[PDB]
Design a protein around this ligand. Sequence first.
Ligand SMILES: [Ca+2]
Length: 153
Amino acid sequence: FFACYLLTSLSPRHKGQTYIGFTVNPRRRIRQHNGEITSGAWRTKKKRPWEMVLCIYGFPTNVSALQFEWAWQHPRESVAVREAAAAFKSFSGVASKIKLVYTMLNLPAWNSLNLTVNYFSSKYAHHGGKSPSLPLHMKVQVCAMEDLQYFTK
Ligand SMILES: [Ca+2]
């Protein structure tokens, strides 16, 4: 199981700030960012509580997921993403990070992969409706953390 994920902060001092990362265990990872586990969350610990908005999984290797993570975090450096990124009005906030990742899922670098977009709450799924449609073999679902965890094993 190799995933990239998106958080958003519910801290009033950082409200709406996002975090993008790579993980093999989303439940462990959100617990780390929120301090329920005391590892893995230097700096992000200060912006609690975080919500995990979504993750994308199905990458065939850790390396394939890490290539996607790096481009999502650095769309202006990525060869694959930069032309699409040159047309974006904003890179800030959940709405922009989701529009960007749906754009990425349509690029040749990733659009042949058998990927799933997992929203952890219906709260965020409408952003996908305002983003470019995904390649038709990809899956979009709303699945809470407690249910997806069994599929990560
Ligand atoms: Ca690692």
